Design an enzyme around this catalytic site. Structure first.
Site, PDB file in Angstrom:
ATOM      1  N   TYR A 141       0.847  -1.168   0.000  1.00 39.51           N
ATOM      2  CA  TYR A 141       0.000   0.000   0.000  1.00 39.51           C
ATOM      3  C   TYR A 141       0.893   1.231   0.000  1.00 39.51           C
ATOM      4  O   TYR A 141       1.682   1.411   0.913  1.00 39.51           O
ATOM      5  CB  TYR A 141      -0.901  -0.044   1.231  1.00 39.51           C
ATOM      6  CG  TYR A 141      -1.351   1.303   1.714  1.00 39.51           C
ATOM      7  CD1 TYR A 141      -2.115   2.143   0.898  1.00 39.51           C
ATOM      8  CD2 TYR A 141      -1.009   1.747   2.990  1.00 39.51           C
ATOM      9  CE1 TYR A 141      -2.535   3.380   1.343  1.00 39.51           C
ATOM     10  CE2 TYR A 141      -1.421   2.984   3.445  1.00 39.51           C
ATOM     11  CZ  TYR A 141      -2.184   3.787   2.615  1.00 39.51           C
ATOM     12  OH  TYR A 141      -2.599   5.009   3.051  1.00 39.51           O
ATOM     13  N   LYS A 148       2.553  12.274  -2.192  1.00 43.10           N
ATOM     14  CA  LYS A 148       2.741  13.119  -3.421  1.00 43.10           C
ATOM     15  C   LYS A 148       1.466  13.790  -3.814  1.00 43.10           C
ATOM     16  O   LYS A 148       1.458  14.982  -4.118  1.00 43.10           O
ATOM     17  CB  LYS A 148       3.318  12.385  -4.640  1.00 43.10           C
ATOM     18  CG  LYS A 148       4.679  11.637  -4.346  1.00 43.10           C
ATOM     19  CD  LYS A 148       5.758  12.478  -3.507  1.00 43.10           C
ATOM     20  CE  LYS A 148       6.729  11.593  -2.665  1.00 43.10           C
ATOM     21  NZ  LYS A 148       8.164  11.996  -2.839  1.00 43.10           N
TER      22      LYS A 148
END
Lengths: 229, 195, 225, 220
Positions: A141, A148
């Site tokens: 994950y 970001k």
């Protein structure tokens, strides 16, 4: 092009640092540069690299964005020491609690918030406007992904927030550089090869310079157009 | 910066044309420019404007992108007359409406790209600048085109990027895109619109 | 759920048409269905397919979306023969100018016109759904469609008409990609006609009552990669 | 439709809560519901509202998603008390470093942890739904999280999707009944409906998607 422009350059670590690429380019165009490192250990290494450049004098500042105080103080000293600045390049990227709350938040802190604060503090050296640029760099994950995302959004909203302050905020989304991922990129990147520090530095120059004078809140992919795939 | 660079600049109509802004900027950077107009009526206007520039000489070419033949001949002459170029700047309910819109707005790029490709043996940069708004549908088609052309011509070392829209500011980004400065950027669309 | 709802279903060609999956589902929920085919050759195939369903009676309609005339008349006959409807399901460097435009015509414009014409059988509104399957001009055409969907969704908001798209994953080079989407796509499996029909039903149904201009990926979330 | 389906519904606060709209709809379809509240003060309000529904019995659980401990424990009790569940609806709502991080914590991470915990009650798969200046950045993070979770949980046959809803309760509202295509404004039920769709088998191929229930305002 950039004679008489003064830029703060954050995130140099070694000569391979993307940030450093960015540095060589701006130097080459005749801007005066200021630098920030995190670890004391790296101060010497920066002084070495500033040799490689035609930098009249060495302006180094130890800043850990991870801490309000240091960022506050750092910009003030730069302010005191150098006066107003034209822009800031903010290079960061650090993935070390695979799904931990600390992991998550820390990611956010470093990857997204650092920009917010830097921006807020740099703004004080930019009474007539300027340009800020954030550059950007897998398992179960991907938390770094989520960081970001947060970043990019932050860029939009800062871009938006500082618009009236005539300050532009944009991002550079970097593709890989000097081996299985070098397989993938040279494989599938339309431009059929890998980018590198310099190319980034070039777009970076673009962004920090008046050349990009209508562009804010944008994210530019310097990755041999790998994004479009 | 751009001395010895040769660019084809399409879509000037008057001194207000964005394409013209783009021109002034590239002229000022010392690139030699080639021009394309659609209506004969506008060849004169263009000659007028080339006077504002420091262009050694006037290279004008009438090209209706709406028609394969003109485009093909157009670029060839440019080829013959000027030799290779470094890149191109391309500035421009019913079934007929829809299709026309697509034809002019999106496809024009495709064919231009295909023909200009022949003058860029060593790569270059192409740039496209941009109630149910079929027009929107046309821009969507465009932007996509850009990605896939960017993609298709990647290996031919040709970069395809778009500018989404004053004149000068575009020109400047335009200049960035056409220049080596944008050397890792292809398939990107840049908003010059004060964000 | 859908008793007394009437839907036009376009683009069945064989038992494998996604458009047919969609059909099976809306049949099962008790909607009355109208059908459109392009080729005369396929009218028979449709009759055969309608047999699998509990369709009271057969309303088939030959329509080439590629032509204004057929589309106009087509809807008018449906109008006359069936009265109003509740929705429509619409399933359909080098590259020449014709190719490009053709692609646009079929993949994007088709929706516009269908929309414009179906509108007339939905005085009190309804739902239109475009399904999409998957140098490629085809991409550019999809792009153009998806936008169109947003703009139609937009222009038809006020007439109480919802326009949405479904973007679909593979079933039936192929054998290689039915593998591809089975490794990296989250869910692991591949999709199918039914899955779509389900979402399709959602969209056409009142279930999706605040949703317009949306595009839904029925691809085991492959889009996310 | 939803007889014998069991869903956890998080974020009811009052009768106006979107989560509550979601609730009415699921109840009406014959699913059995479990609820979580944050504030002790709101447990009584929940018992009041569970009256409006045809809920055999009230299973209420105090959970602060802001804390790993409560979330872990809550889900287990749910586990023990009700057995496995078919899905979870996660509704959560509403400068400095702290502000930034708090927003992330609550808006985005809450999903991550809830997912991770809910997962253990869904051995054969199920559906998770998250409904939705700095707050923008938080949603972005969220929307990303949904993707990555959708992605991470795909193999476990667990679907993760989001609903983005346009405001409910006179200015910024005018702008919407004005500008938006679908011409009026959005509400709880509408969400509940899509919610139903997403938690149901109806959305069986859809994961990592964000649906806008906002009278198509997103399209503008």
């Amino acid at each position: 092009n950039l004679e008489n422009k003064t830029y703060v350059i954050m995130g140099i670590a070694n000569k391979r640092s993307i940030a450093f690429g960015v540095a060589k380019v701006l130097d080459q165009l005749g801007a005066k540069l200021v630098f920030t490192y995190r670890k004391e250990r790296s101060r010497k290494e920066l002084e070495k690299l500033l040799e490689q450049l035609n930098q009249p004098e060495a302006h180094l500042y130890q800043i850990d964005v991870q801490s309000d105080e240091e960022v506050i103080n750092g910009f003030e000293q730069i302010g005191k020491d150098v006066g107003n600045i034209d822009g800031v390049y903010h290079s960061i990227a650090f993935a070390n609690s695979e799904t931990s709350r600390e992991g998550f938040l820390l990611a956010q802190d470093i990857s997204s918030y650092s920009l917010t604060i830097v921006a807020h503090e740099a703004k004080k050296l930019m009474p007539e406007g300027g340009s800020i640029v954030a550059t950007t760099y897998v398992q179960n994950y991907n938390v770094m992904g989520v960081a970001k995302a947060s970043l990019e959004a932050n860029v939009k909203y800062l871009a938006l927030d500082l618009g009236p302050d005539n300050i532009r905020v944009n991002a550079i989304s970097a593709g890989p550089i000097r081996n299985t991922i070098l397989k993938e990129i040279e494989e599938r990147a339309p431009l059929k090869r890998n980018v590198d520090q310099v190319e980034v530095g070039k777009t970076a120059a673009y962004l920090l310079s008046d050349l990009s004078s209508g562009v804010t809140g944008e994210n530019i992919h310097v990755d041999s157009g790998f994004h479009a795939i």
